[PDB]
Amino acid sequence: ARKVTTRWKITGTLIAETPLHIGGVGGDADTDLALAVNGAGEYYVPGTSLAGALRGWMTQLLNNDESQIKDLWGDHLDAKRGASFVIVDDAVIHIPNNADVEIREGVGIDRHFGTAANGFKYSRAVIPKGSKFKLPLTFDSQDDGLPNALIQLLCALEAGDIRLGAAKTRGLGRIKLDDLKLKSFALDKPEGIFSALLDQGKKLDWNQLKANVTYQSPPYLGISITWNPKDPVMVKAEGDGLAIDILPLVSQVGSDVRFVIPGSSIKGILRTQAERIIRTICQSNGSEKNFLEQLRINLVNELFGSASLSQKQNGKDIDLGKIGALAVNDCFSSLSMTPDQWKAVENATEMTGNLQPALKQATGYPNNISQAYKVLQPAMHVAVDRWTGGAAEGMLYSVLEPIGVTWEPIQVHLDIARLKNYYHGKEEKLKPAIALLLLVLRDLANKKIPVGYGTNRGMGTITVSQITLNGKALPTELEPLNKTMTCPNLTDLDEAFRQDLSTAWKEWIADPIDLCQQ
Amino acid sequence: MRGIEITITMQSDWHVGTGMGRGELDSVVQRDGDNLPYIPGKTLTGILRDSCEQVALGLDNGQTRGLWHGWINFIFGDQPALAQGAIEPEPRPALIAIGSAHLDPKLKAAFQGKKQLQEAIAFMKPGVAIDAITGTAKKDFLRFEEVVRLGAKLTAEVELNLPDNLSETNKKVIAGILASGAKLTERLGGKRRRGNGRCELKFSGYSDQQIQWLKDNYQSVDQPPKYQQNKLQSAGDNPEQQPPWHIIPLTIKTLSPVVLPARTVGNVVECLDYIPGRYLLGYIHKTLGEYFDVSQAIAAGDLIITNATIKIDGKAGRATPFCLFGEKLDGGLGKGKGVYNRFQESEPDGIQLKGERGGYVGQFEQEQRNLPNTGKINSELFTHNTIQDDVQRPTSDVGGVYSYEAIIAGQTFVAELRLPDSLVKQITSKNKNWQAQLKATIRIGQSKKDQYGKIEVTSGNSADLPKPTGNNKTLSIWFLSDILLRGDRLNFNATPDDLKKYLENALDIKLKERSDNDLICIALRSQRTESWQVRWGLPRPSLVGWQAGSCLIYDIESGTVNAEKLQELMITGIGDRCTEGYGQIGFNDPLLSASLGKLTAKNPLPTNHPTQDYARLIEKAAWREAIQNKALALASSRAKREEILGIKIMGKDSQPTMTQLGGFRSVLKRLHSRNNRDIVTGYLTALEQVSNRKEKWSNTSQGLTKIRNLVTQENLIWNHLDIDFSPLTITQNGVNQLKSELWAEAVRTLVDAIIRGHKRDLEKAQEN
Amino acid sequence: FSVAYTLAERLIKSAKEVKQKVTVTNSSPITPFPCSAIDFHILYDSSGIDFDRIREKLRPEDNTELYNRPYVVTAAENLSQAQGYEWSQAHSLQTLADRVSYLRSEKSALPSSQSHALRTALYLEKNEADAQYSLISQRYKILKNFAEDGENKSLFHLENGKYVTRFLDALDAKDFFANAN
């Protein structure tokens, strides 16, 4: 056979730290994008999808060196490499308790009219959060010990730095490894081959290898925004309720339901303001473009990403698509409910009847409707007919306004390494994208970006009390980003840095080239 | 010997065996004769060998050649295609034969004729390659692969033909290695490294006790014993042959594909469409060699085993006579009309004929009034690879890929064993029930130990001797085997004049070629056969002759032919190596005298069955996709949408508005089970209790009650779908349970399809 | 090359079936009318390397076949005096070349996204292939050209009792119709 000095069984629990979507061929009559299922119909991570997740990350770690990658992941064409030395099995996903798959609604909002673009209405089945699956990894070593690149990979898994599945920038795909175990079998020797057959291997202390190494986390900037809703903030639930027509969106977060602001939603509002800034400077209109064309404007194509779209340039064929360097994570409330407490609200039928206990229960104030309704408040609304007054026939509707729901910080993740690759390594080309992002954050802090449903209709205004910029391995001129800002107008960043960004920003405004074309 | 099995439990979805894809698939798994997925015995041998190579490589302390690698070459045989230079020892064959792992026989029977279910055993896995800098799908790199559902338990027959002298210690070494390498096997097939093909592989009777013995004893183990052939031993004690000749017809049925090498050229072996008798000489030595000296009988010419040719009309199909010519545009035996025996019929006006060149014709009497039945032998190409063990993928150094044509399973062939009365006396004096010993199951051919070659042999009753007619005017000859005359210089370059001289001498009659100018008189083709002799370890010489089917007819100029002698030559054959089946003649056959141009041709699984769980996964898949496809069809017509939900178009208008349908459809998303039909009935009563919302649904064809019914009458979704689920179920009580299981999904699926087909028909009326 | 050439020796017989579907009018014996035709494959290795197996994987249902691939290349005007003229038009290579042009024509006039939805549907029964097409036919007006029913509601046409289509041939040949002219 292939010689194996030592075989390693590497295993542990991978937890969805955000929702997850590995897609099958697509579409189950309940979702336009349907989760991948094994032959038993169980939700699973294809070992292909995890192998490429871990190989892909390793490719960025190792500066896209083909040699060491193919040394561990095999190669079809080298005459001495062939099959992979890392085996990745298919891993079934255990959704916590037996929580069902969530369906997540999606819409594209026309940048001219500010409303749902026609056709751009979709839904994605997503694995909840808290869901667990096995890390099914085996490594056949021909060298002695365990590769540094493979130790670095396992460090990134425990750091939660690898992302899996679809929609990685739009909320999804974060996994974390826990309870990593290493079993070693010296298949080169009699005692180790029999141990493979009988004894389940020598346990290695991961903490020993974890001490021998420093985790080489790639360049990234992380933005964490602390917001409290000023006006109620909520994404609309997928369909009208009984006692309340318009209910907040919830997600399963372990064994409990929490109010969620999808990262798809925070990313679309940030993208919308980012694009509006760019178009405002260039005085570039969006009314004649269709929605896919409206999205495709400079700097946001790199930051927020662009659709895959192969185009013949001239003989050469180029993908216009790139993943977003900017990734936003779903936001969740401080406020959780048991999965049935919320069903008590969704299935309430009378606003002054059984809804009152349901909200008293779910808010945690079973005996204070006043305190309960300072958290979740039902609001009736009328359309008033313009000749008669009174109310228009049929136009009576109710919102469950989460007036006092408290939220977790919004967490944005800028892959500086991904941007730098788009800019072909040129760290000087980062400054306009950074300048744009800080301008978008200045607007977010100044209440210029409302979030969620009903922003024009009494909801969606947020107060931003802190923004914490916390990058790692940033290029030396971007290091003044490492700041906790509390002034909305960025004046906590050093003026010499804000002037340097402003200079590069103004240089780009003067000639707004496609900054990743070279 | 028999009794060992390999049990394979597939623990992840699995892909094997083929470099081809179907309509929506770019890689399709390999499928047995039942069209069911299976693990080919060459894949299973190769996988199990590799895992034994790992164990041996560990026991050798990582030495690539050593004591325990010798044991692998003992058990699995040497690999002479790798070794190079002057390797002196003859290559050992394997001690282990490993069949193909097939699905449970009763489960396989449940599938028969259920084409839709056979497809549901496997599904598309998506595959895409992502660009490392953009993080997006690469161009070109999008594939869809067929994968077979996990949970499949497959079993392969295994045979261990251990040497007779092998010690009990060495037996336990072989058991230990095989038990070890089986337990070390965790993957098989394609993309093993990326999830696929995870398995448990177990031998029957090799528990971990066999591994534990090896652990306790591996240090005491010597080199394997030296291999030697089972040589032949001749008693010499046979009687002289005495008439009559008994004829013992042997039916051969192929139970796995059989490779019978015609042309071995490069990386492909082409296959015969008949079994030569030489393949059965080993089975004759086994079963009968205890009764008489089979080797002396072969030497004396006291034994014939004919070729096993395809069974037609309950008899051995006869090689299509080359005197038959078809109309080149609109005739021949495959068309079933327009066949002329050019020995007797002139070529028609205008139409040019082509010779018949192959296949087998059935029986034909002198007044058949029909063309003879034509038997065709089904054969399939099987493709294999060799893996270079350090890169773990095929390479040019190992030859990459090779193919065998094989006669597929289920084919039925008839041979005849002919023996003189003196030997049949000898046998019957030693066993009166001796034809019962001719029932056997044997492996013949190329690659006979693994995936190929399994045949059942069954004897009939003693057949009648041939009855050639001693026509004094003309004699015809039909070749039913390949005639191997030697020239006068003992090489095989004989000519038709050598055959004329041969028959003239044998029958004591002078012959002359018939001169009728419109009629052909000789229709031979030559044949050259290249074969190996397993007892020589060298190829046979090359045997040149004329093909089966070759024909000729002579005018008998003087002398009188004896039907007793024609019969004798119709039993013993003429020329070289008639004991193997060469030389088989047909004399004065009707089909060569006749004129033909005017003629024409004429269960569900037991509920407790262990594969019931796995079968139920196949059922849901077949049901789900059936429901989906039918929902598409039903939604494609506006009359069926109005029947099922009352939804209709009124010009530009939709009844109700799409917003009202969206409200319903958003509630139906909550119909996960029939315990949630109260959710939809809650919505409908609230809708009905509000007058303005109820009026929104007037001018529907009673849509609110149609929705109430579909949600609350469990049979009604199935009435609308009207799928016949009998071709889609194999579990007993499958229909009742799957209807109870898939109800809510079927309701959701149909309404979703209807509302989509409604909106897209509305767009045709609305968008003008 | 060997496998590819034995395919060609089978493809040449499939093209050479024009010899008896297009025939000299009032001939006796029925002579072929001189007619030129192509059959082509595009192996990918996936289709089965044997022609008989290749075509039965594109006949997904007993009345439905997803290939029109013996294409006459002789001009219609030259064929008009033969028997079997109507067949030669349905099998005219220009019908394939036109449909390929519509696929190539442009962003894509027919999105590959939607071509492949139709491609997938073709392996279903006609009632499901036509259902998918009816979900699409008026979103992409170019599809009025890819229809073959004469109704603009199906990709199939009836030929000697078989539903046959050029659409999946046009997807195959979409990139094998290039010329320096």
String of DSSP letters for A112-173: TTSSEEEEEEEEEEEB-BS-EEE--EEEEESSSS--HHHHHHHHHHHHT--B-SS-TTEE--
**From the CA atom positions of chain B, what is the Rg in Å?**
34
- Would you state the structure tokens that stand for residue B52, as one six-digit string? 């034994």
Helix (H) or strand (E) holding A334: strand A331-337
Q: Which residue has the tokens 């894509």?
A: C108
Residue of B nearest to A310 (CA): B139
Q: Which residues, 6+ apart, have CB-to-CB distance to B671 below 8 Å?
A: B677, B679, B680, B711, B744, B747, B748
Distance CA A259, CA A242 (A): 19
Nearest-CA distance from B388 to chain A in Å?
9
Dihedral angle over CA of B162, B164, B168, B169, nearest 10: -70
CB count in 10 Å sphere of residue C80: 10
Tell me which chain B residues have a C-beta less than 8 angstroms from the C-beta of C125. Answer: 629, 633
Cβ proximity of B605 and B107 under 8 Å:
yes
Distance CA A37, CA C35 (A): 52
C47: nearest CB among B20, B329, B757 = B20
**DSSP structure class, residue C128:** H
Cβ proximity of B211 and B268 under 8 Å:
no
Across the interface, whether the CB atoms of A83 and B64 are under 8 A apart is answered: no
Q: Which residues, 6+ apart, have CB-to-CB distance to A272 below 8 Å?
A: A109, A111, A449
- Would you state the structure tokens that stand for residue B227, as one six-digit string? 């291999």
> What are φ and ψ of residue A232, in 5° steps?
-45, 140
- Would you state the structure tokens that stand for residue A135, as one six-digit string? 């890390």
Distance CA A206, CA A196 (A): 20
Across the interface, whether the CB atoms of C46 and B767 are under 8 A apart is answered: no
Distance CA B111, CA A57 (A): 45
**From the CA atom positions of chain A, what is the Rg in Å?**
26
Tell me which chain B residues have a C-beta less than 8 angstroms from the C-beta of A194. Answer: 211, 214-215
Tell me which chain A residues have a C-beta less than 8 angstroms from the C-beta of B686. Answer: 242, 349
- Write b or e for each residue in B64-98: b if 16 or more Cβ atoms lie within 10 A of its Cβ, otherwise e: eeeebbbbbbbbbbbeeeeeeeeeeeeebbbbbbb
**DSSP structure class, residue B100:** -
Dihedral angle over CA of B57, B63, B64, B70, nearest 10: -70
Across the interface, whether the CB atoms of B195 and A48 are under 8 A apart is answered: yes
Given the DSSP bridges, would you call strands B318-319 and A137-141 parallel, antiparallel or unpaired?
Answer: unpaired
Nearest-CA distance from C124 to chain B in Å?
8
Across the interface, whether the CB atoms of B633 and C46 are under 8 A apart is answered: no
CA angle A398, A402, A408 (to 5 degrees): 155
The residue count for chain C: 181
CB count in 10 Å sphere of residue A383: 12
Nearest-CA distance from B616 to chain A in Å?
10
B194: nearest CB among A2, A47, A196 = A47
Distance CA B210, CA B173 (A): 8
Q: Establish how many alpha carbons lie within 13 A of residue A31's alpha carbon, considering only the half-sphere containing its beta carbon.
A: 21
Tell me which chain B residues have a C-beta less than 8 angstroms from the C-beta of A56. Answer: 130, 132, 135
Cβ proximity of A409 and A226 under 8 Å:
yes
Amino acid A289 reads: K
CA angle B223, B227, B229 (to 5 degrees): 170
Distance CA A91, CA C164 (A): 43
Amino acid A160 reads: G
Tell me which chain B residues have a C-beta less than 8 angstroms from the C-beta of A190. Answer: 58-59, 61, 218
On whether B222 is known to bind a ligand per the annotation, the reply is no
Cβ proximity of B273 and B379 under 8 Å:
yes
Strand arrangement, sheet containing A410-414: A170-171, A326-329, A410-414, A220-229, A462-472, A483-485
**From the CA atom positions of chain C, what is the Rg in Å?**
17
Across the interface, whether the CB atoms of A84 and B193 are under 8 A apart is answered: yes
Tell me which chain B residues have a C-beta less than 8 angstroms from the C-beta of A140. Answer: none
Given the DSSP bridges, would you call strands B268-271 and B401-407 parallel, antiparallel or unpaired?
Answer: parallel
- Would you state the structure tokens that stand for residue C160, as one six-digit string? 């000697």
- Would you state the structure tokens that stand for residue B257, as one six-digit string? 């594909």
Question: Nearest-CA neighbor of B173 among B66, B92, B75, B49?
Answer: B75
Q: Which residues, 6+ apart, have CB-to-CB distance to C113 below 8 Å?
A: none
- How many helices (H) does chain A have, and how many strands (E)? 14, 23
Question: Nearest-CA neighbor of B356 among B378, B323, B330, B329?
Answer: B323
Alpha helices in A225-338 (DSSP H): 263-282, 291-295, 300-303
The maximal CA–CA distance of chain A, rounded, in angstroms, is 95
Report resolution in angstroms.
Answer: 2.8
Cβ proximity of A106 and A54 under 8 Å:
no
Cβ proximity of B518 and B347 under 8 Å:
yes
- Would you state the structure tokens that stand for residue B393, as one six-digit string? 């993928």
Across the interface, whether the CB atoms of A46 and B194 are under 8 A apart is answered: yes
In order of B328, B444, C72, C85, the CA distances from C82 in angstroms are 22, 55, 13, 6
Across the interface, whether the CB atoms of B19 and C45 are under 8 A apart is answered: yes
Residue of C nearest to B755 (CA): C135
Distance CA A416, CA A427 (A): 9
B24: nearest CB among C123, C127, C138 = C123
In order of A348, A400, A453, A484, B679, the CA distances from A343 in angstroms are 8, 14, 21, 40, 11
- Would you state the structure tokens that stand for residue B591, as one six-digit string? 């089909």
Distance CA B693, CA A394 (A): 8
Helix (H, G, I), strand (E, B) or coil at C151: coil
Burial class (CB within 10 angstroms; exposed 0-12, middle 13-18, buried 19+) of B560: exposed
From the annotation, which residues of A make up the binding site for Mg(2+)? Answer: 245, 396
**DSSP structure class, residue B445:** S
The residue count for chain B: 768
Burial class (CB within 10 angstroms; exposed 0-12, middle 13-18, buried 19+) of A499: exposed
Cβ proximity of B153 and B611 under 8 Å:
yes
Cβ proximity of A405 and A333 under 8 Å:
yes
> What are φ and ψ of residue B32, in 5° steps?
-70, -170
- Would you state the structure tokens that stand for residue B228, as one six-digit string? 């030697």
Q: Which residues, 6+ apart, have CB-to-CB distance to B141 below 8 Å?
A: B128, B129
Nearest-CA distance from B670 to chain A in Å?
10
Distance CA B10, CA B188 (A): 9
Cβ proximity of C99 and C88 under 8 Å:
no
Helix (H) or strand (E) holding B407: strand B401-407
Determination method here? cryo-EM
Alpha carbon distance, N-terminus to C-terminus of chain B: 79
Tell me which chain B residues have a C-beta less than 8 angstroms from the C-beta of C57. Answer: 22-23
- Please spell the DSSP secondary structure of B657-707, one letter per residue: -HHHHHHHHHHHTT-SSGGGHHHHHHHHHHHHHSHHHHHHHTTSSSHHHHH
Residue B632 in contact with partner chain A when CB distance is under 8 A: no
Nearest-CA distance from B338 to chain C in Å?
14
Cβ proximity of B179 and B211 under 8 Å:
yes
C127: nearest CB among B21, B25, B633 = B633
Distance CA B149, CA B618 (A): 8
- Would you state the structure tokens that stand for residue A3, as one six-digit string? 């010689």
Q: Which residues, 6+ apart, have CB-to-CB distance to B137 below 8 Å?
A: A308, A321, B128, B129, B130, B131
How far is C-alpha B681 from the geometric centre of its chain's CA atoms? 55
- Would you state the structure tokens that stand for residue A164, as one six-digit string? 């899996």
Strands (E) across B301-390 are located at 304-305, 309-312, 315-316, 318-319, 324-327, 339-341, 353-355, 360-361, 374-375, 379-385
Across the interface, whether the CB atoms of C29 and B764 are under 8 A apart is answered: no
Backbone φ/ψ region at A481: left (φ over 0), alpha (ψ -120 to 50), beta: alpha
Q: Establish how many alpha carbons lie within 13 A of residue A455's alpha carbon, considering only the half-sphere containing its beta carbon.
A: 13
- Would you state the structure tokens that stand for residue A13, as one six-digit string? 């629990």
Distance CA C121, CA A401 (A): 45
From the annotation, which residues of A make up the binding site? Answer: 245, 396
A83: nearest CB among B51, B132, B393 = B393
Distance CA A374, CA A356 (A): 13
Nearest-CA distance from A214 to chain B in Å?
24
